[PDB]
From a paper:
Here we report the single-particle cryo-electron microscopy structure of the native transmembrane channel-like protein 1 (TMC-1) mechanosensory transduction complex isolated from Caenorhabditis elegans. The two-fold symmetric complex is composed of two copies each of the pore-forming TMC-1 subunit, the calcium-binding protein CALM-1 and the transmembrane inner ear protein TMIE. CALM-1 makes extensive contacts with the cytoplasmic face of the TMC-1 subunits, whereas the single-pass TMIE subunits reside on the periphery of the complex, poised like the handles of an accordion. Single-particle reconstructions and molecular dynamics simulations show how the mechanosensory transduction complex deforms the membrane bilayer and suggest crucial roles for lipid–protein interactions in the mechanism by which mechanical force is transduced to ion channel gating.
Numbering used by the authors:
A (entry chain C), E (entry chain E): 18 to 201
B (entry chain A), D (entry chain B): 75 to 459, 664 to 886
C (entry chain D), F (entry chain F): 18 to 63
The structure:
């Protein structure tokens, strides 16, 4: 009985995970670091138990992701450099196959920006390109790519993509739901 | 008062329902949940008893649904295996395994439907069969002592003769008694007919429901999409499921190549070239493909015709129709692939053309085999005329085809994946040419070909389940073996594809092919039920001149003759044809609506 | 015993037990026949 | 070189084609035309002979099309009359007259189709009929001398008996000879069957082509429309056709009222009210309407049943089925209108409800009359069994119905429009209440009711043209009389409506109703052709056991028996039902696509 | 032979009228003023024959139109206060039932503005309302109407409607082609 | 002549010629039975 009935009830209302999924996620969280994760966590313990960003990034699911740090930062709480069990649950419930398209779009947009001003500028797109491609494209090549992206995905002529334009553009791609998914 | 209470209840219910689908933090979600719970508790003593009862019933329904879901998640198998395949190979390879798991679930449901109402009651009646029922069913449930000595011969068994012919697996085993027994009064022929109809109805319902869930509830906004090449190849350019280093490097290289080729195509925009050699090669390849299709038709017809014997004249030649068709089904695709090398063009349209040719070959073989089998059974029944059991014979042919298909699939997996991989590993150093860096390679998972194999097998199961009630029960074991062997082969022998494309990039593509196959397979079953006459010496329908007579004879026993004669006239051809015309007219109306909406959307996009 | 009425059962039983042993053994090990592209490139260079 | 020449030719052709549809001045248009002509003349000596020949053929085709159009505009009647009606009453009233003119054209085309190939060859064969043909056709083309004395009695003539029964107007007049004569070899029964099928095919084609021209080529952008209340009620708020002072003042008042009520509705946005009296009145009215519909069914059935005599027992009672049905068709609508006063609500939905009730009444009367007529003919044929001619009798009933409908329409026009208007004009000073300022008034043109009258008459013509070949020829005169009398009545007696609404505000609304009526009318003709057997003493099909036998006997004379037996099996019910299922499936797919497109459009509009 | 073969050929290419329609329109033009319209007009005579705006507005087709003056001004040539035979033909070919929806929309937009700056401002809409309604609406009523029109038919927030917005709004009305039509 | 075999032709001919005369006469005049709203208002006021 790691979690009480009310804890699992709240978890099921908030997330897309059943009791078995919650138990499996807790087992994985404990396996990430047995010393820092208490066995008994009834009450407010989950909100106070934290792991370093590197320790969470060490898991096989996020090991090879170019945007692992961005995912960890986006799904973290106000604390910087620490990820809690609740944030872990939120992260792996957003990426689930049961999550709706709107939530995935919102969190993908939040991941793909870096400054955090709710806009995908030239610098953010360039950083994303050099992260995904692994600096295997020439500077002219990259710049042409951001030029195309900004000119074909902008309606207000702001040279920046807001959340509404990003959703309107990439929600019609049939491969976003298929790709933006982590099984756990 | 009442309106304010209704508004508050609606707002609280909407907030609680949408709490999960909100991009909020966990602390914010918990705070909102507690606030909503406190507000509902405060508002509890605001309404009358009826609203309280309604809220209580809704809460009970929600709790029971949650409990059922929690119990259901404990009975979902092959999650770790599919997760490992996804992490090692990607999210496009694992689509085949998820499709196979869904097919297994559907087949299990069909098995339960056909086992609760047909096989189990008949077996229970047989166990308690009296002297009269034993005497009435000895001729169909007991193997004759003349043939009982030859019941096991490695050829009688391999052909499902002997003990298997007199088993609940086949149509001729079931009795003609209108009632199973006393104190039960179970109509077995009616159960047989209704179960056969219900299996097709449930298959249609399940396929349509899966299609609606995949499209209408998930990608209803994907309609009327345009351009967005760089957006779709950059924002959806990384597979989050991949967790292997080599697969990650392959994905990085693939995305780099995709971006480079898209930019190269968009830069020059010049397409001028005309070589007679390429056109000659293309037309030659498209001609030899048709020649091979005709050769396949001829081989299938010849194999069916040569199996003109019903008595045990010979068995090393009677089993040539399952060995031939399966061979084509497993050997012609790869040859097609080789021909696709002659016709060099865009890999995406090459894959689409290969899928089209394979689908055409499968449908042509299906139709040819069905026609040849029906003609052969008609000729044999005419020549022999107690009367033979053509339904049991057709069931035997279908079951033998399925078994040989499984055997050939196992052999192909062993040869193409395991032995070829070992040969490449241990013979690339001293070969004549570098096989590892040349065409041979180690092997890639063909998602579309394997899914088409699954769909073809399911079509055979749908076609042959009327004559073989326990065909889906065997298909369950076949599908489980297929899943395990395919997982092992992909994990141990295959390498990730350097760049894997999709024929349609749509979720309901294979489901649409499956629905088309279901219609194609319900065509001949419907023809058999409507036209052909049951055997007089086997099966549960031996007392009627038609398969549907068991249903009409009960309908006519509860409906007056005058109204029956009035309703029979709607089935007239001159009334049916206007219905077809009306359906075509509404199809034309809906097509015009779709075209107008598309034109309006394109005009709005161009203007704005 | 019998050449046409009993030998095939013995052969099938031997094949079945051999296949069961092969499946059980292969369910406890993680063969990976292909080699990574890095190993292929290293072999090609040398 | 060649590519530049092709581009120049395409640009010149596009400019010349689009010259008319351009919002340019006349001088600019002429300058562009001369520039294009000079450029084409300069570019003439640039291409080879093949391009010159292609351009010459295209120019000849365009010139011939222009000449044909110029000749065609000289044969379009009733232009000044429709223009006057439009200028005096508006562009919604004249829609009925344009619809009537199109219906007249379609009926004339049908008349020509049925007259070139059936009536004219048979009349020519009769004129040159030898002794043998005269002897063979005397029993059906010559009135017996016993009855010839009573050929004209004001009741024999009014019932289309006597000389009219033995006229080319009816089915029984035509002969059974397979060939009309020597050196011609004209098959008359085949011509009859093919003309009957071709008339329905051409009617379907014409209705669909008109629908496509009205919607797809004109208002393809009107799909997915929303709001725009003030824009649509202000930018499209004046009828440019109106050229009368009183009608202009009425239009100004109507637009003022429209704007005021739209603003009043948008201001308060409060809808709270519940009176038991209004609900009781509404349910009472909806109950008495159903009671009157049942009473209409009972009256039609009683009138058909009482006409149980085939011999001349009495004629003042046999003619009660045309006088009753027509009466309902002309008297029940106005009563409906009065009931609509009890059910007070939005005038637009009131008009839609009235149209729905009238359509339901018309369809119910149609079905009841068809069923009663078929049952009566079956009973009479069974009782009497040379054999009677049921096709001629059915044709006579349809023709009498059409004639009585015209008579009742003329009487209703005279009473409601002329006499009521005169009574209001000369009796409003000293009446008990001010009729001029009260409900009586002078009268308004009911566009929807009159269009439904036209559609009902056309449905009768479609139903009865197989048994009466010259029914459309009579309907031409009926439609011409109707157009003239309606124009006179609207010009002389009616006043413009203070505010006229539309049921659907769509161009293809009445055309859609007409297509539905065409399908409903082709249902019983198809049943008759497929099921019923021809009479053995009348008509051209007296030598066959079925109506379609004249076609199959020729198909079987050019097609082998084996392939015929193979193709007959597709008509099996078990093959037909899957076709229906497939059509329903594609209808469901198109409906889901339409719903998804609409949802995407609404979401895009809401977001942006 | 009022018009030569080439004159009628050019008229048929430019307009939607056949030879009979051209002859009828010429007859009506002559009937408007027999003295000012020469019987013989072969050559360039149609471009030089003009009638006053009032004389053309006297015809029954345009007599009761509130926007008769606007129609005459829109369809007139560079000359002010004069309408020629070619402009008469253009006017009655634009209003025909054979004219396409786009041409009708363009000329309706050109009619509905008064200043001539390709924009439907508050003043132009107010003038159109007071012309169509005949000053039967209160000032608050009128202003409310233009407020609704501008707010529900504007995409750039310019408080003015351009041609593209006007077409996009009123081309989906089923009563525009039915109403914007003059039979002759 | 005949009461049941010839009177109806005479009646029909008389009706037909009378109807032809009525149609020809009514094709040369422009009757307008209703009165305009202005006349109705003027009558109501007086
Ligand atoms: C009637 C037809 C009878 C045919 C019966 C043949 C049954 C053979 C396949 C049985 C089977 O299910 O094999 C499962 C086995 C398990 O593989 P897996 O657990 O996925 O291994 C993990 C990867 N490291 O996966 C394997 O295939 C094990 C390897 C065995 C070699 C292939 C078996 C056919 C010989
Ligand atoms: C078998 C059935 C036979 C019935 C035959 C009855 C024929 C009567 C209608 C004939 C007809 O077409 O009337 C045309 C007549 C012309 O009216 P119109 O030219 O439009 O007048 C211009 C308006 N100022 O319009 C008229 O209706 C003239 C008025 C005649 C009164 C009504 C006719 C029925 C009496
Ligand atoms: C989805 C499942 C429930 C479908 C199973 C098939 C149904 C339609 C079949 C299977 C068993 C059948 C019943 C078996 C026994 C009887 C008793 C007999 O005197 C009347 C018919 C009746 C009542 C049958 C009606 C049809 C029936 C209910
Ligand atoms: C739209 C129009 C053209 C349709 C008219 C109906 C057509 C289909 C009918 C009317 C006249 C018919 C023809 C009349 C005479 C003959 C000669 C006979 O020995 C063979 C059939 C043949 C050749 C008939 C074929 C069908 C036919 C052409
Ligand atoms: C069963 O059938 C056999 C046929 O010979 C008969 O002898 C025997 O009496 C029967 N027994 C019954 C009625 O169960
Ligand atoms: C026509 O039929 C009559 C029947 O009596 C017969 O007498 C006469 O000879 C026939 N004439 C022909 C063959 O035209
Ligand atoms: C890899 C997971 C193995 C556990 C699940 C095995 C279930 C096998 C039978 C499934 C169909 C009933
Ligand atoms: C008012 C115009 C009258 C001239 C046209 C008369 C044509 C009448 C017959 C039309 C159908 C052939
Ligand atoms: C069409 C088929 C052509 C090839 C036939 C081979 C046997
Ligand atoms: C040789 C038969 C080829 C059939 C191709 C079917 C696929 C159509 C779309 C190709 C692009
Ligand atoms: C015939 C079955 C469907 C074939 C489609 C080819 C593309
Ligand atoms: C492919 C299926 C087409 C219909 C087959 C009917 C065969 C009846 C035996
Ligand atoms: C989004 C709906 C896609 C439907 C795809 C249907 C594919 C049919 C292929 C026929 C072969
Ligand atoms: C199934 C049981 C037998 C499997 C092994 C068969 C070996 C044949 C050689
Ligand atoms: C339903 C019809 C009810 C009224 C019947 C009147 C006869
Ligand atoms: C009494 C029958 C009423 C039928 C109404 C049909 C029209 C449906 C739409 C009304 C709003
Ligand atoms: C039944 C015919 C159609 C009636 C429609 C009423 C709305
Ligand atoms: C309404 C028409 C419905 C079908 C009528 C068939 C009558 C056959 C006689
Ligand atoms: C014989 C001519 C009869 C004309 C009657 C017109 C009514 C339809
Ligand atoms: C724009 C297409 C409108 C089609 C209207 C069809 C009306 C059908 C009415 C049935 C009664
Ligand atoms: C149609 C010819 C007769 C018309 C006048 C009939 C008068 C009946 C009284
Ligand atoms: Ca940014
Ligand atoms: Ca932007
Ligand atoms: Ca397989
Ligand atoms: Ca009528
Ligand atoms: Ca302006
Ligand atoms: Ca604007």
């Amino acid at each position: 009985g790691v979690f009480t009935r009310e804890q699992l009830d709240e978890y099921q209302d908030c997330t897309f995970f059943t009791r078995k999924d919650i138990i499996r996620l807790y087992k994985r969280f404990y396996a990430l670091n047995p010393h820092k994760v208490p066995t008994n966590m009834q009450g407010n313990r989950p909100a106070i138990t934290t792991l370093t960003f590197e320790e969470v990034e060490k898991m096989p699911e996020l090991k090879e992701n170019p945007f692992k740090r961005r995912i960890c930062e986006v799904f973290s709480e106000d604390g910087r450099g620490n990820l809690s069990f609740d944030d872990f649950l939120d992260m792996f419930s957003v990426f689930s196959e049961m999550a709706p398209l709107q939530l995935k779009l919102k969190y993908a947009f939040r991941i793909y920006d870096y400054d955090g001003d709710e806009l995908l500028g030239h610098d953010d797109l360039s950083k994303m390109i050099r992260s995904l491609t692994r600096d295997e494209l020439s500077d002219v090549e990259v710049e042409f790519i951001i030029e195309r992206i900004i000119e074909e995905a902008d309606l207000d002529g702001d040279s920046s993509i807001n959340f509404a334009e990003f959703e309107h553009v990439v929600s019609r791609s049939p491969d976003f739901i298929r790709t933006f998914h982590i099984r756990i | 008062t009442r309106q304010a209470l209704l508004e508050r209840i609606r707002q609280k219910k909407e907030v609680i329902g949408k709490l999960r689908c909100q991009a909020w933090s966990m602390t914010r979600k918990r705070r909102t949940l507690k606030l909503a719970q406190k507000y509902l508790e405060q508002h509890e003593s605001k309404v009358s008893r009826s609203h309280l009862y309604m809220e209580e019933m809704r809460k009970r329904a929600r709790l029971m649904k949650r409990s059922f879901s929690n119990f259901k998640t404990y009975l979902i198998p092959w999650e770790s295996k599919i997760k490992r395949i996804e992490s090692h190979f990607g999210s496009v390879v694992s689509s085949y395994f998820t499709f196979l798991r869904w097919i297994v679930f559907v087949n299990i449901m069909i098995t339960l439907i056909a086992l609760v109402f047909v096989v189990l009651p008949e077996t229970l009646a047989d166990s308690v069969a009296n002297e009269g029922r034993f005497n009435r069913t000895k001729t169909r449930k007991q193997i004759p002592a003349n043939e009982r000595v030859h019941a096991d011969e490695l050829a009688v068994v391999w052909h499902y003769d002997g003990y298997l012919r007199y088993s609940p697996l086949f149509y001729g085993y079931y009795s003609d008694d209108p009632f199973l027994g006393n104190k039960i009064k179970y109509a077995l022929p009616l159960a047989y007919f209704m179960v056969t109809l219900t299996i097709f109805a449930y298959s249609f319902f399940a396929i349509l429901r899966k299609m609606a869930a995949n499209a209408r509830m998930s990608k209803l906004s994907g309609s009327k999409a345009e351009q967005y090449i760089f957006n779709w190849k950059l924002f959806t350019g990384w597979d989050y499921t991949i967790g292997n280093s080599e697969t990650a490097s392959n994905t990085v290289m693939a995305v780099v190549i995709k971006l480079r080729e898209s930019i190269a195509d968009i830069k020059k925009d010049a397409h001028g070239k005309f070589r007679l050699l390429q056109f000659s090669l293309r037309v030659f390849a498209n001609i030899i493909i048709c020649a091979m299709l005709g050769f396949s038709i001829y081989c299938i017809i010849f194999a069916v015709q040569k199996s003109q014997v019903q008595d045990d004249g010979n068995l090393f030649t009677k089993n040539q129709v399952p060995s031939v068709v399966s061979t084509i089904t497993h050997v012609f695709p790869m040859i097609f692939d080789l021909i696709g090398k002659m016709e060099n063009y865009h890999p995406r349209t090459a894959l689409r053309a290969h899928l089209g040719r394979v689908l055409i070959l499968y449908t042509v073989n299906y139709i040819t085999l069905i026609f040849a089998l029906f003609e052969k059974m008609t000729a044999l029944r005419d020549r022999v005329n107690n009367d033979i059991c053509w339904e049991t014979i057709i069931g035997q042919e279908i079951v033998k085809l399925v078994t040989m298909d499984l055997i050939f699939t196992i052999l192909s997996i062993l040869v193409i994946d395991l032995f070829r991989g070992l040969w490449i590993k241990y013979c690339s150093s001293w070969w004549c040419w570098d096989i590892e860096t040349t065409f041979p390679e180690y092997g890639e998972f063909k998602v579309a070909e394997n899914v088409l194999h699954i769909i073809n097998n399911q079509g055979m199961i749908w076609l042959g389940l009327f004559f073989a009630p326990l065909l889906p029960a065997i298909n369950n074991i076949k599908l489980i073996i297929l899943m395990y062997i395919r997982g092992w082969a992909v994990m141990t022998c295959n390498v990730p594809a350097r760049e894997i494309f999709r024929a349609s990039r749509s979720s309901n593509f294979y489901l649409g092919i499956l629905l088309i196959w279901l219609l194609l397979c319900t065509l001949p079953v419907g023809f058999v039920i409507a036209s052909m006459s049951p055997s007089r010496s086997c099966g549960p329908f031996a007392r009627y001149q038609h398969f549907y007579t068991v249903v009409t004879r009960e309908i006519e026993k509860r409906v007056d003759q005058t109204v029956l004669s009035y309703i029979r006239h709607i089935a007239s051809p001159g009334v049916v044809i206007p219905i077809i015309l009306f359906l075509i007219l509404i199809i034309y109306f809906l097509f015009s609506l779709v075209r107008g909406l598309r034109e309006a959307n394109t005009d709005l996009q161009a203007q704005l | 015993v019998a050449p046409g009425l009993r030998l095939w059962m013995l052969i099938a039983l031997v094949g079945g037990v051999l296949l069961i042993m092969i499946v059980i053994v292969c369910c406890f090990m993680r063969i990976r026949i292909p080699r990574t592209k890095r190993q292929i490139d290293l072999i090609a260079a040398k």
